[PDB]
């Protein structure tokens, strides 16, 4: 499967009258989920749970109301799987992948923010045709190209391609030139943006060089972050 970050505390019980929420994001077969653990550290039960997202850069929104039938009792912990889609209202956020959230129960409402890893927004149909790749790489202005060092990665090309493909980043071509592997890759976001990539792998260097071309180059740093996470994990 694709890379899933370990759950992080998004709402600590000290800030939320005893309610702790830890979470992560998954994306299996195009279905995006916010996977959470709610823990009641308090002395009273908790009921009447609901959640709301603020508008955000990629229009992420829950697909259903929160799934919680019975009271969450003192010292109880439950796993909550919230399906999301990208058909919701859009507002540019800073950082670009910031999500503002409000969760309420019977005691209060609690606001927090978390970061959506961009890889959960990589769609399954993100393999560019080869002819189109060549034309697009030429056509996108060279001033849009941004380069990044993926440091202390020493996986071979085949392993890199496989890990990336498992995360919907497709290898369109692989060439060996002057003893260096050059991997040409594509991916597409849920909002239709294509990113094209060249990944350079040498004997000699500890670091791979990632060059990214995108018509919205603001997204490139976030793509780098998740390349780095996928290849390191």
């Amino acid at each position: 499967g694709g890379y899933v970050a370990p759950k992080a505390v998004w709402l600590p019980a000290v800030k939320a009258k005893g309610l702790e929420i830890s979470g992560t994001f998954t994306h299996r077969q195009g279905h995006i989920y916010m996977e959470m653990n709610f823990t009641n550290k308090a002395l009273q039960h908790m009921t009447d749970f609901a959640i709301q997202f603020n508008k955000n850069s990629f229009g992420v929104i829950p697909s259903t109301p929160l799934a919680i039938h019975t009271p969450l009792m003192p010292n109880q912990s439950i796993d909550v799987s919230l399906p999301l889609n990208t058909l919701g209202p859009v507002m540019k956020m800073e950082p670009l992948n910031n999500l503002q959230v409000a969760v309420k129960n019977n005691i209060d409402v609690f606001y927090f923010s978390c970061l959506i890893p961009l890889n959960v927004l990589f769609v399954e149909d993100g393999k560019m045709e080869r002819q189109v790749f060549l034309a697009t790489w030429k056509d996108i202005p060279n001033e849009n190209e941004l380069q990044f060092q993926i440091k202390e990665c020493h996986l071979n090309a085949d392993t890199v391609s496989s890990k990336l493909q498992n995360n919907n980043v497709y290898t369109i071509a692989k060439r060996n030139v002057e003893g260096q592997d050059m991997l040409y890759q594509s991916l597409k976001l849920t909002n239709g943006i294509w990113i094209l990539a060249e990944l350079r792998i040498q004997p000699g260097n500890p670091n791979y060089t990632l060059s990214l071309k995108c018509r919205a180059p603001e997204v490139s740093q976030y793509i780098y972050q998740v390349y780095d996470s996928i290849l390191k994990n």
């Binding site: 080869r130 002819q131 060549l134 790489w137 071509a173 060439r175 030139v177 002057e178 260096q180 050059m182 040409y184 060249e198």
Partner: peptide
């Protein structure tokens, strides 16, 4: 197959 391997090798060459 699609004949385009040579074009990709030229692209790679042009950037080294």
């Amino acid at each position: 197959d699609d004949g385009l391997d040579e074009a990709f090798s030229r692209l790679a060459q042009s950037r080294t």
